[PDB]
Structure 1
Amino acid sequence: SHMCDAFVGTWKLVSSENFDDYMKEVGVGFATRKVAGMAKPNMIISVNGDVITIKSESTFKNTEISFILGQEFDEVTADDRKVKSTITLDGGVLVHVQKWDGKSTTIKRKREDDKLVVECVMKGVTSTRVYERA
């Protein structure tokens, strides 16, 4: 109970930095990078018992994942990578690791003031995306 309460709700993207380079590092192709980078998703985070659901909705794609913290799952990403994902809570930060083809990327979400800040890291490339409550 009360797992992730400060993350629950509906969030809207308000800024992005370094996201094209992050996607390039991950291996996303040119056309998908351009359309995805233009996207202004809403992110809807909910909890029911031990299950967390994260939906991301935009003109580019609508995605949905549901998971239990610490319990790996298979994910098909917005670029159609088949990845093995594990999401944990570490010190208040939601940490999402995706593994595929001997590669790994981490997406970290944290509450800062009234924002939800998202840090995407692939090797030495980091992108920061900031969301506000809808």
Structure 2
Amino acid sequence: HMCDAFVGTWKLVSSENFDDYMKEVGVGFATRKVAGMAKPNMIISVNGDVITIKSESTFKNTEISFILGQEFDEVTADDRKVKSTITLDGGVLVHVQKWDGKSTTIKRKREDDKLVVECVMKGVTSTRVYERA
């Protein structure tokens, strides 16, 4: 029952500062433009100890499956090859990606009827809000 309130199909409804987050990450111009247009659906499911988070969009589709606290390989939508670890901290999913000596953290939280995704690269934060699809 760990992540019950995250499970479901979610649609992006707002974004703030994502272009500046992507710049800080190192994403190039053309990818930022096309990635910034996308309105993804995020599909979260749980089977036993395995959590799956899928993103379906016109830009890229991504999918990760993982066990909390257990590092895995991830290919991001912008084609970084990163080493990821996801934990639950006080009801918040905390996703840390490491690559080329860099790090970025993505937090996913339930707030009212929304799922809020906060992405931080150094001093730059983007907030992306999802509602049930």
The C-alpha deviation readout for 1:17-53, integer Å capped at 9, x for no partner, is 0000000000001000000000000000000000000
Please list every run of 5 or more consecutive structure 2 residues that lacks an aligned counterpart in the other structure.
none
TM-score when normalising by structure 1: 0.98
Q: Distance in 1 between matches of 2:2 and 2:109?
A: 14
Shift of 1:3: 1.6
The C-alpha deviation readout for 1:83-123, integer Å capped at 9, x for no partner, is 00000000000000000111000000000000000000000
The C-alpha deviation readout for 1:4-24, integer Å capped at 9, x for no partner, is 000000000000000000000
Deviates more, 1:74-83 or 1:123-132: 74-83
Partner of 2:26: 27
The C-alpha deviation readout for 1:54-109, integer Å capped at 9, x for no partner, is 00000001110000000000111111111000000000000000001110000000
Q: Distance in 2 between matches of 1:90 and 1:102?
A: 24
Q: Distance in 2 between matches of 1:36 and 1:86?
A: 23
What is the percentage of aligned positions where both structures have the same residue?
100
Q: Distance in 2 between matches of 1:30 and 1:93?
A: 31
Q: Distance in 1 between matches of 2:29 and 2:77?
A: 14
Q: Distance in 1 between matches of 2:8 and 2:77?
A: 22
Q: Distance in 2 between matches of 1:43 and 1:12?
A: 6
Q: Which stretches of structure 1, 4 residues or more, deviate above 3 A after TM superposition?
A: none
Q: Distance in 2 between matches of 1:37 and 1:63?
A: 15
Q: Distance in 2 between matches of 1:104 and 1:63?
A: 19
Partner of 2:37: 38
Aligned residue pairs total 133
Deviates more, 1:46-55 or 1:73-82: 73-82
Alignment of 1:11-90 (within 5 A): 11-90=10-89
The alignment partner of 2:27 has SS state of coil
The alignment partner of 2:55 has SS state of strand
